RNA sequence: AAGGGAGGCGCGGCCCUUCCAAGGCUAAAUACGCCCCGGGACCGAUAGCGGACCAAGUAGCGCGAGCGAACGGUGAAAAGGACGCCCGGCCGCUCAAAAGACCUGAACCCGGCCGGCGCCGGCCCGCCGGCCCCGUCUCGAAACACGGACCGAGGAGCCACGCGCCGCGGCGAGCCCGAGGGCCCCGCGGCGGAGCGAGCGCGAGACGCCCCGGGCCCGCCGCGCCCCUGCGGGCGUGC
């Protein structure tokens, strides 16, 4: 099986063999685990000040003055309690919280490969959120050479059929709902296509477009492949990147790709096949259950038990 | 009955008074 | 994650699993390991025999790499030979061409005798041998050698 | 009121399901549970139960132990609901047909170069779902180092070692040592 | 997307920059379009507003054309002639409704030596850019 | 004192291995507040610094050392309130709107008009039936045991490290984002793999789906017998 390769015009111009990294099993659980750990490794620490609440002078007045026993400032004002106005925190936050998390190298690689495998399905890409109604193929390889003007980059995206995804991103810019707009996160835009390039100057023509991201094929980012921790991203591939993918996995040293496995479609097929149906065997018939009623009421109800009639009816 | 190996860790020193004995690594990428 | 933990399923319960008659106090047994001979003696005797006292000679400074001593069994000797030449060595068992294995090159000093060797002559060069390692090797037709 | 206490015991909880997040495990479990439901076959019953275990109840099996176990019945299919590892201390491997959850790479290469077969459980469920000429096998569930410390070292009938480091002598030199 | 790392993209710092700006920056901040005719003539897109310029207003509830009588740089606004709050008396004085300079296109420019020279300076720099590109 | 120092157990003797005290200079890789610059899954006016307010270490308190608050928000524009009438009020005026000393404007509590005279249940409705004050310590609370006039807002198992066990993921006789060097690439220890013995040291195959027990093997303690290189090797017996 071979992927198609289209021009910057829309016509079909080449065939190229499938890279093996798309044959890896689909693991939403592993992608969620890695996405969590790595996205949590990007944080900036925060903490309250270490002197806060404790710069004033306060001591307890003791019993015998008809007041509660907390420490008090000269004059009698409450202080040094978490329940006093102007006191310290009960357990102040501290920067020695462990902010990062560790992930093994195989697990990181496996998450990248499962995200790429998900990217090559016309069903998970449509179920993730992108608009793929007018695309020729989901492994989408287009020869572009060098794009330097946004107008020509938009022209290619139109000529291939990814124009509604970028318009979805463009017409969704709004101001977010909460406190987050006081903290340099005022606007939200949706996400569209990801362009992966190898030898070809494209960033200067694609970057401006809303909802577009750039990734050089030798260093692929899981947070870009699975935004929101949802795997199937729409990827516009350069010919050179799509042709150097296998070289990249060969450059990974003492590493082999994980073994491909079957799907619930394959289990379903096996079970309904004849080699498994030939060994079935029917169960015994179930009990027959009625609701208790008084046989002595009438003649037929009694005659279910004793038909001869020796027992009187009532 | 608790069957645990005894922890062999030393008590913290100078946590709020003396020289700063806590070294962070927020600067290693820099 | 704070949102999946036991402690927050106790909101509205006053004491938080610590009891009304007993309660949660600061240090109702003392701090650390104290009391092991008096009021924790049942614990210490049940679970930690030989925790108190003294045993044996003491060395004021141990030489870690003098006392270091790695070891290999004879059931492992044939796996140091790469996989692509054992078939040949086994097929053409030779008194005149025999495999020579030097185990200090692989980082072992003494050779012990757990297991068995294949029926094939072999020279083994180490720095010390055990009695039945020698026995089994000289029983399969190998030779023990001492290496500098 | 009714008395449902005397002569009756507390009910019992066992794993009716695997709690793995792995879709391969979940699918194999549902499939073999269906086969049990429709055929009987305590073989499929035991296999369905074994696919629910907790990975300390599923030790590994080595090719050398398997060769020893399948000796003089070499024509039967070994079935292992765990990983098969390799044993470099066995210079020559025989030809065997093994079916396992996972194989190591070196184990797969040694089995194939001997001449035997490496099967999966979907392979098993297609070619033979009820285990005619299969043998279910498992490893030593009490091979873990953790299970060697369970008990009361210090009690005079224990034969179990203590947990940390103990540098003294009191109670450690036999009876009449306290 | 920005690239320069000595320039903040922080809302707090940007708003504090907009307030508490010094007078030269404030004057530059109070600019407006030239009309099409002056764009053709001077080959320049925008100018800082000034007394003696005639301005045509839109987008507001006070739409018209008038001369710039006053410049309120603290407020960043301009008092134009004829554009007022509706008064109560028939006699009482006018009171200017303050217009913000970006709600205007300048229609006719006050000229003097400095205005001429700074315009020619700006043209030559835009020409350097146009020769580079 | 004259050749001397050291070799993680003292004294005396003979050696070996390796250095030259009682004088001096010296970059780099390392650490850090004030002040300036950038960033943040941080706080949002009883929070966050004590201190967001033209005048905070200010006003105020103490002989003194020293202690130390409270107070943010009209409107797009001040357009910040015409004219008339009584002798402060009324009318109305600006404005989208009085938002009129100011955003919204809850509760507790109160004044004027209108209606009527505690919870649960039945009935349309004032009858009949049931109902001690909660929280707490306690064998036992309605207690003549303690706390609590009312209302608002705040208010107490979080974090770091170490130890045990359980679950899940990856790889498996192996495993591993040390530090560092060029969300990607390369990257030592270490732990596991053999134990036992104070130590000199010696050193495990024989059985078994799994579990439990039996048997046998390795070390520590003891003892027959045979021998080669010998208080050393072999072969056995016992708790
Ligand atoms: K203080
Ligand atoms: K009190
Ligand atoms: K009190
Ligand atoms: K305060
Ligand atoms: K790894
Ligand atoms: K990754
Ligand atoms: K809200
Ligand atoms: K508890
Ligand atoms: K108790
Ligand atoms: K205590
Ligand atoms: K204590
Ligand atoms: K202690
Ligand atoms: K103790
Ligand atoms: K002693
Ligand atoms: K123990
Ligand atoms: K404007
Ligand atoms: K010595
Ligand atoms: K010393
Ligand atoms: K010494
Ligand atoms: K304050
Ligand atoms: K009480
Ligand atoms: K009491
Ligand atoms: K009592
Ligand atoms: K009570
Ligand atoms: K009570
Ligand atoms: K009473
Ligand atoms: K009473
Ligand atoms: K009372
Ligand atoms: K009481
Ligand atoms: K009392
Ligand atoms: K009391
Ligand atoms: K009371
Ligand atoms: K690691
Ligand atoms: K001994
Ligand atoms: Mg007090
Ligand atoms: Mg505070
Ligand atoms: Mg309870
Ligand atoms: Mg207690
Ligand atoms: Mg005592
Ligand atoms: Mg404050
Ligand atoms: Mg108000
Ligand atoms: Mg009271
Ligand atoms: Mg509250």
PDB file of C-alpha atoms (C1' of nucleotides) in Angstrom, chain F residues 5-232:
ATOM      1  C1'   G F   5      57.019  12.999  56.759  1.00  0.00           C
ATOM      2  C1'   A F   6      52.910   9.341  55.427  1.00  0.00           C
ATOM      3  C1'   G F   7      50.868   4.446  54.470  1.00  0.00           C
ATOM      4  C1'   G F   8      42.447   4.921  59.097  1.00  0.00           C
ATOM      5  C1'   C F   9      44.750   0.215  66.223  1.00  0.00           C
ATOM      6  C1'   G F  10      49.283   1.012  70.250  1.00  0.00           C
ATOM      7  C1'   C F  11      54.946  -0.226  71.430  1.00  0.00           C
ATOM      8  C1'   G F  12      60.130  -2.030  69.672  1.00  0.00           C
ATOM      9  C1'   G F  13      63.167  -4.044  65.179  1.00  0.00           C
ATOM     10  C1'   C F  14      64.054  -4.997  59.926  1.00  0.00           C
ATOM     11  C1'   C F  15      62.274  -3.840  55.147  1.00  0.00           C
ATOM     12  C1'   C F  16      59.165  -1.868  50.938  1.00  0.00           C
ATOM     13  C1'   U F  17      56.020   2.033  48.342  1.00  0.00           C
ATOM     14  C1'   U F  18      55.534   7.156  47.998  1.00  0.00           C
ATOM     15  C1'   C F  19      56.357  12.588  49.221  1.00  0.00           C
ATOM     16  C1'   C F  20      59.789  17.136  51.053  1.00  0.00           C
ATOM     17  C1'   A F  21      56.572  20.898  56.460  1.00  0.00           C
ATOM     18  C1'   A F  22      57.724  24.902  59.449  1.00  0.00           C
ATOM     19  C1'   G F  23      58.004  31.244  53.172  1.00  0.00           C
ATOM     20  C1'   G F  24      54.920  33.491  48.854  1.00  0.00           C
ATOM     21  C1'   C F  25      51.598  34.667  43.968  1.00  0.00           C
ATOM     22  C1'   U F  26      47.830  32.893  40.569  1.00  0.00           C
ATOM     23  C1'   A F  27      42.601  33.073  35.585  1.00  0.00           C
ATOM     24  C1'   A F  28      38.418  29.687  34.871  1.00  0.00           C
ATOM     25  C1'   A F  29      34.318  26.336  35.922  1.00  0.00           C
ATOM     26  C1'   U F  30      30.877  28.228  41.683  1.00  0.00           C
ATOM     27  C1'   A F  31      27.438  31.659  44.994  1.00  0.00           C
ATOM     28  C1'   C F  32      24.228  35.936  45.625  1.00  0.00           C
ATOM     29  C1'   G F  33      19.981  40.708  48.079  1.00  0.00           C
ATOM     30  C1'   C F  34      19.310  45.806  46.863  1.00  0.00           C
ATOM     31  C1'   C F  35      18.207  48.355  41.494  1.00  0.00           C
ATOM     32  C1'   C F  36      16.988  47.455  36.017  1.00  0.00           C
ATOM     33  C1'   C F  37      14.771  43.851  32.169  1.00  0.00           C
ATOM     34  C1'   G F  38      11.540  39.667  30.589  1.00  0.00           C
ATOM     35  C1'   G F  39       8.134  35.720  31.860  1.00  0.00           C
ATOM     36  C1'   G F  40       3.947  33.042  35.040  1.00  0.00           C
ATOM     37  C1'   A F  41      -1.981  26.617  34.986  1.00  0.00           C
ATOM     38  C1'   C F  42       0.137  32.594  41.251  1.00  0.00           C
ATOM     39  C1'   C F  43      -3.458  36.823  44.379  1.00  0.00           C
ATOM     40  C1'   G F  44      -7.660  39.889  43.010  1.00  0.00           C
ATOM     41  C1'   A F  45      -9.032  44.886  47.729  1.00  0.00           C
ATOM     42  C1'   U F  46     -10.622  41.155  55.310  1.00  0.00           C
ATOM     43  C1'   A F  47      -6.793  38.352  49.221  1.00  0.00           C
ATOM     44  C1'   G F  48      -1.792  39.558  47.463  1.00  0.00           C
ATOM     45  C1'   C F  49       3.913  42.948  50.681  1.00  0.00           C
ATOM     46  C1'   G F  50       2.300  46.234  56.747  1.00  0.00           C
ATOM     47  C1'   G F  51       1.767  49.575  52.312  1.00  0.00           C
ATOM     48  C1'   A F  52      -2.947  49.228  44.629  1.00  0.00           C
ATOM     49  C1'   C F  53      -5.929  55.364  47.377  1.00  0.00           C
ATOM     50  C1'   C F  54      -1.353  63.251  44.355  1.00  0.00           C
ATOM     51  C1'   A F  55       1.263  63.022  50.667  1.00  0.00           C
ATOM     52  C1'   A F  56       2.673  54.125  54.314  1.00  0.00           C
ATOM     53  C1'   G F  57       7.011  52.822  57.682  1.00  0.00           C
ATOM     54  C1'   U F  58       2.362  57.624  56.882  1.00  0.00           C
ATOM     55  C1'   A F  59      -1.635  59.199  60.865  1.00  0.00           C
ATOM     56  C1'   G F  60      -1.633  57.620  65.725  1.00  0.00           C
ATOM     57  C1'   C F  61       0.545  55.227  70.659  1.00  0.00           C
ATOM     58  C1'   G F  62       5.050  54.657  74.159  1.00  0.00           C
ATOM     59  C1'   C F  63      10.278  58.546  78.876  1.00  0.00           C
ATOM     60  C1'   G F  64      12.677  55.080  75.702  1.00  0.00           C
ATOM     61  C1'   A F  65      14.300  50.549  73.108  1.00  0.00           C
ATOM     62  C1'   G F  66      10.202  50.069  69.926  1.00  0.00           C
ATOM     63  C1'   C F  67       4.773  49.364  68.060  1.00  0.00           C
ATOM     64  C1'   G F  68       1.909  50.742  63.797  1.00  0.00           C
ATOM     65  C1'   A F  69      -3.521  51.152  61.088  1.00  0.00           C
ATOM     66  C1'   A F  70      -7.909  52.324  58.007  1.00  0.00           C
ATOM     67  C1'   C F  71      -9.310  54.212  53.361  1.00  0.00           C
ATOM     68  C1'   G F  72      -9.710  51.275  45.436  1.00  0.00           C
ATOM     69  C1'   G F  73     -14.465  52.032  41.318  1.00  0.00           C
ATOM     70  C1'   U F  74     -19.869  58.806  38.652  1.00  0.00           C
ATOM     71  C1'   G F  75     -20.388  59.243  33.506  1.00  0.00           C
ATOM     72  C1'   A F  76     -18.582  58.034  26.548  1.00  0.00           C
ATOM     73  C1'   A F  77     -18.257  63.416  27.788  1.00  0.00           C
ATOM     74  C1'   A F  78     -18.501  67.423  34.009  1.00  0.00           C
ATOM     75  C1'   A F  79     -22.133  68.091  30.024  1.00  0.00           C
ATOM     76  C1'   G F  80     -21.502  68.475  38.264  1.00  0.00           C
ATOM     77  C1'   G F  81     -27.774  70.251  38.148  1.00  0.00           C
ATOM     78  C1'   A F  82     -31.962  75.668  33.398  1.00  0.00           C
ATOM     79  C1'   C F  83     -36.784  78.174  34.061  1.00  0.00           C
ATOM     80  C1'   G F  84     -40.819  79.171  37.125  1.00  0.00           C
ATOM     81  C1'   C F  85     -43.279  79.275  42.310  1.00  0.00           C
ATOM     82  C1'   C F  86     -43.376  79.752  47.664  1.00  0.00           C
ATOM     83  C1'   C F  87     -40.534  81.180  51.917  1.00  0.00           C
ATOM     84  C1'   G F  88     -35.071  75.179  52.593  1.00  0.00           C
ATOM     85  C1'   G F  89     -39.216  72.804  49.769  1.00  0.00           C
ATOM     86  C1'   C F  90     -41.859  71.914  45.077  1.00  0.00           C
ATOM     87  C1'   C F  91     -41.929  71.728  39.741  1.00  0.00           C
ATOM     88  C1'   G F  92     -39.214  70.584  36.100  1.00  0.00           C
ATOM     89  C1'   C F  93     -33.761  70.968  33.493  1.00  0.00           C
ATOM     90  C1'   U F  94     -28.428  67.746  31.533  1.00  0.00           C
ATOM     91  C1'   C F  95     -28.027  62.743  30.233  1.00  0.00           C
ATOM     92  C1'   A F  96     -29.378  56.369  27.377  1.00  0.00           C
ATOM     93  C1'   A F  97     -29.949  56.673  32.595  1.00  0.00           C
ATOM     94  C1'   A F  98     -29.298  60.252  37.742  1.00  0.00           C
ATOM     95  C1'   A F  99     -25.346  57.057  37.801  1.00  0.00           C
ATOM     96  C1'   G F 100     -26.596  63.663  41.684  1.00  0.00           C
ATOM     97  C1'   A F 101     -21.426  62.131  45.396  1.00  0.00           C
ATOM     98  C1'   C F 102     -22.095  58.865  43.155  1.00  0.00           C
ATOM     99  C1'   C F 103     -21.117  50.940  39.592  1.00  0.00           C
ATOM    100  C1'   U F 104     -24.197  46.771  41.268  1.00  0.00           C
ATOM    101  C1'   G F 105     -26.393  47.367  46.171  1.00  0.00           C
ATOM    102  C1'   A F 106     -27.597  40.967  49.635  1.00  0.00           C
ATOM    103  C1'   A F 107     -28.366  39.870  55.076  1.00  0.00           C
ATOM    104  C1'   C F 108     -29.306  41.249  60.145  1.00  0.00           C
ATOM    105  C1'   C F 109     -32.519  45.368  61.758  1.00  0.00           C
ATOM    106  C1'   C F 110     -36.337  49.303  60.952  1.00  0.00           C
ATOM    107  C1'   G F 111     -40.765  53.287  58.960  1.00  0.00           C
ATOM    108  C1'   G F 112     -45.426  54.096  55.958  1.00  0.00           C
ATOM    109  C1'   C F 113     -49.840  51.615  53.180  1.00  0.00           C
ATOM    110  C1'   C F 114     -52.512  46.553  52.553  1.00  0.00           C
ATOM    111  C1'   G F 115     -53.743  41.273  54.656  1.00  0.00           C
ATOM    112  C1'   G F 116     -53.634  37.895  58.739  1.00  0.00           C
ATOM    113  C1'   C F 117     -52.894  36.096  64.297  1.00  0.00           C
ATOM    114  C1'   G F 118     -43.268  27.582  65.577  1.00  0.00           C
ATOM    115  C1'   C F 119     -42.043  22.317  62.575  1.00  0.00           C
ATOM    116  C1'   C F 120     -44.401  17.601  60.517  1.00  0.00           C
ATOM    117  C1'   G F 121     -49.276  15.127  58.669  1.00  0.00           C
ATOM    118  C1'   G F 122     -54.541  15.172  56.784  1.00  0.00           C
ATOM    119  C1'   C F 123     -58.022  18.151  55.028  1.00  0.00           C
ATOM    120  C1'   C F 124     -58.373  24.569  51.981  1.00  0.00           C
ATOM    121  C1'   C F 125     -57.246  26.546  56.505  1.00  0.00           C
ATOM    122  C1'   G F 126     -58.341  26.586  61.452  1.00  0.00           C
ATOM    123  C1'   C F 127     -59.401  22.230  63.763  1.00  0.00           C
ATOM    124  C1'   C F 128     -57.549  17.403  65.249  1.00  0.00           C
ATOM    125  C1'   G F 129     -52.975  14.188  66.021  1.00  0.00           C
ATOM    126  C1'   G F 130     -47.370  13.900  66.894  1.00  0.00           C
ATOM    127  C1'   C F 131     -42.860  17.083  68.429  1.00  0.00           C
ATOM    128  C1'   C F 132     -37.819  19.187  75.089  1.00  0.00           C
ATOM    129  C1'   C F 133     -31.868  22.955  72.716  1.00  0.00           C
ATOM    130  C1'   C F 134     -28.360  22.055  69.301  1.00  0.00           C
ATOM    131  C1'   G F 135     -22.946  20.973  69.167  1.00  0.00           C
ATOM    132  C1'   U F 136     -19.662  18.205  72.856  1.00  0.00           C
ATOM    133  C1'   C F 137     -17.141  14.874  76.691  1.00  0.00           C
ATOM    134  C1'   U F 138     -19.603  10.803  78.762  1.00  0.00           C
ATOM    135  C1'   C F 139     -21.995   4.180  81.368  1.00  0.00           C
ATOM    136  C1'   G F 140     -25.700   8.181  81.020  1.00  0.00           C
ATOM    137  C1'   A F 141     -27.782  15.217  78.836  1.00  0.00           C
ATOM    138  C1'   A F 142     -33.944  18.782  78.180  1.00  0.00           C
ATOM    139  C1'   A F 143     -30.570  19.274  82.249  1.00  0.00           C
ATOM    140  C1'   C F 144     -29.634  23.410  87.923  1.00  0.00           C
ATOM    141  C1'   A F 145     -22.630  20.450  83.023  1.00  0.00           C
ATOM    142  C1'   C F 146     -19.847  23.877  79.210  1.00  0.00           C
ATOM    143  C1'   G F 147     -20.001  27.073  74.315  1.00  0.00           C
ATOM    144  C1'   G F 148     -23.602  29.820  71.485  1.00  0.00           C
ATOM    145  C1'   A F 149     -28.055  38.002  71.069  1.00  0.00           C
ATOM    146  C1'   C F 150     -28.334  38.594  65.578  1.00  0.00           C
ATOM    147  C1'   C F 151     -26.208  38.967  60.457  1.00  0.00           C
ATOM    148  C1'   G F 152     -22.292  39.002  56.500  1.00  0.00           C
ATOM    149  C1'   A F 153     -17.305  37.720  54.780  1.00  0.00           C
ATOM    150  C1'   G F 154     -12.763  34.710  56.368  1.00  0.00           C
ATOM    151  C1'   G F 155     -11.625  30.108  58.955  1.00  0.00           C
ATOM    152  C1'   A F 156      -8.411  24.162  60.074  1.00  0.00           C
ATOM    153  C1'   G F 157      -4.790  16.650  56.992  1.00  0.00           C
ATOM    154  C1'   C F 158      -1.597  20.695  51.925  1.00  0.00           C
ATOM    155  C1'   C F 159       3.570  20.222  50.536  1.00  0.00           C
ATOM    156  C1'   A F 160       8.982  17.866  50.729  1.00  0.00           C
ATOM    157  C1'   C F 161      11.777  13.652  51.921  1.00  0.00           C
ATOM    158  C1'   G F 162      12.287   8.353  53.746  1.00  0.00           C
ATOM    159  C1'   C F 163      10.084   3.236  54.639  1.00  0.00           C
ATOM    160  C1'   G F 164       6.229  -0.939  53.684  1.00  0.00           C
ATOM    161  C1'   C F 165       2.442  -3.050  50.769  1.00  0.00           C
ATOM    162  C1'   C F 166      -1.050  -2.956  46.624  1.00  0.00           C
ATOM    163  C1'   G F 167      -2.565  -1.547  41.314  1.00  0.00           C
ATOM    164  C1'   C F 168      -1.411  -0.139  36.476  1.00  0.00           C
ATOM    165  C1'   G F 169       2.481   1.058  31.928  1.00  0.00           C
ATOM    166  C1'   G F 170       7.175  -0.035  29.378  1.00  0.00           C
ATOM    167  C1'   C F 171      11.138  -3.400  28.657  1.00  0.00           C
ATOM    168  C1'   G F 172      13.040  -8.154  30.701  1.00  0.00           C
ATOM    169  C1'   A F 173      18.843 -11.594  32.677  1.00  0.00           C
ATOM    170  C1'   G F 174      18.595  -7.474  32.369  1.00  0.00           C
ATOM    171  C1'   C F 175      17.170  -2.363  33.409  1.00  0.00           C
ATOM    172  C1'   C F 176      17.839   3.037  33.791  1.00  0.00           C
ATOM    173  C1'   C F 177      15.179  11.651  30.511  1.00  0.00           C
ATOM    174  C1'   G F 178      22.676  11.141  36.491  1.00  0.00           C
ATOM    175  C1'   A F 179      25.418  15.183  35.861  1.00  0.00           C
ATOM    176  C1'   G F 180      26.538  16.852  31.214  1.00  0.00           C
ATOM    177  C1'   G F 181      27.194  17.364  25.812  1.00  0.00           C
ATOM    178  C1'   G F 182      24.634  18.334  20.572  1.00  0.00           C
ATOM    179  C1'   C F 183       8.336  17.800  24.320  1.00  0.00           C
ATOM    180  C1'   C F 184      14.104  15.664  19.829  1.00  0.00           C
ATOM    181  C1'   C F 185      19.455  12.996  19.913  1.00  0.00           C
ATOM    182  C1'   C F 186      23.811  10.868  22.867  1.00  0.00           C
ATOM    183  C1'   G F 187      24.791   9.909  27.942  1.00  0.00           C
ATOM    184  C1'   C F 188      28.704   6.422  34.148  1.00  0.00           C
ATOM    185  C1'   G F 189      27.571   4.771  38.288  1.00  0.00           C
ATOM    186  C1'   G F 190      23.768   2.106  40.566  1.00  0.00           C
ATOM    187  C1'   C F 191      20.231  -1.818  41.515  1.00  0.00           C
ATOM    188  C1'   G F 192      19.335  -7.014  39.932  1.00  0.00           C
ATOM    189  C1'   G F 193      22.224 -11.271  38.696  1.00  0.00           C
ATOM    190  C1'   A F 194      24.519 -16.126  44.971  1.00  0.00           C
ATOM    191  C1'   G F 195      24.637 -17.161  49.433  1.00  0.00           C
ATOM    192  C1'   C F 196      26.571 -18.077  54.045  1.00  0.00           C
ATOM    193  C1'   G F 197      30.426 -16.911  57.713  1.00  0.00           C
ATOM    194  C1'   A F 198      32.945 -12.706  63.601  1.00  0.00           C
ATOM    195  C1'   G F 199      36.798 -13.560  60.365  1.00  0.00           C
ATOM    196  C1'   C F 200      40.961 -16.475  57.449  1.00  0.00           C
ATOM    197  C1'   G F 201      37.207 -17.509  53.546  1.00  0.00           C
ATOM    198  C1'   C F 202      34.563 -21.198  51.025  1.00  0.00           C
ATOM    199  C1'   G F 203      30.549 -21.552  47.445  1.00  0.00           C
ATOM    200  C1'   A F 204      24.642 -24.201  45.464  1.00  0.00           C
ATOM    201  C1'   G F 205      20.862 -28.954  40.397  1.00  0.00           C
ATOM    202  C1'   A F 206      17.377 -33.865  42.133  1.00  0.00           C
ATOM    203  C1'   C F 207      13.028 -34.291  41.811  1.00  0.00           C
ATOM    204  C1'   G F 208       7.760 -30.288  40.995  1.00  0.00           C
ATOM    205  C1'   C F 209       1.364 -26.776  35.970  1.00  0.00           C
ATOM    206  C1'   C F 210       0.700 -23.681  40.908  1.00  0.00           C
ATOM    207  C1'   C F 211       0.525 -23.864  46.326  1.00  0.00           C
ATOM    208  C1'   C F 212       2.016 -26.923  50.909  1.00  0.00           C
ATOM    209  C1'   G F 213       5.215 -30.848  52.573  1.00  0.00           C
ATOM    210  C1'   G F 214       9.171 -34.437  51.766  1.00  0.00           C
ATOM    211  C1'   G F 215      14.062 -35.364  49.901  1.00  0.00           C
ATOM    212  C1'   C F 216      18.841 -33.708  48.374  1.00  0.00           C
ATOM    213  C1'   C F 217      22.798 -29.571  47.474  1.00  0.00           C
ATOM    214  C1'   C F 218      25.868 -24.599  49.636  1.00  0.00           C
ATOM    215  C1'   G F 219      27.979 -22.051  54.144  1.00  0.00           C
ATOM    216  C1'   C F 220      28.739 -21.905  59.605  1.00  0.00           C
ATOM    217  C1'   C F 221      29.896 -26.243  64.126  1.00  0.00           C
ATOM    218  C1'   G F 222      31.390 -30.969  65.006  1.00  0.00           C
ATOM    219  C1'   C F 223      33.449 -35.935  63.782  1.00  0.00           C
ATOM    220  C1'   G F 224      34.913 -41.924  60.346  1.00  0.00           C
ATOM    221  C1'   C F 225      38.120 -43.202  56.469  1.00  0.00           C
ATOM    222  C1'   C F 226      41.823 -42.700  51.946  1.00  0.00           C
ATOM    223  C1'   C F 227      45.689 -39.547  49.688  1.00  0.00           C
ATOM    224  C1'   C F 228      48.783 -35.977  45.833  1.00  0.00           C
ATOM    225  C1'   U F 229      51.590 -30.678  45.888  1.00  0.00           C
ATOM    226  C1'   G F 230      49.781 -31.630  52.921  1.00  0.00           C
ATOM    227  C1'   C F 231      46.913 -28.220  59.863  1.00  0.00           C
ATOM    228  C1'   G F 232      46.292 -29.011  51.897  1.00  0.00           C
TER     229        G F 232
END
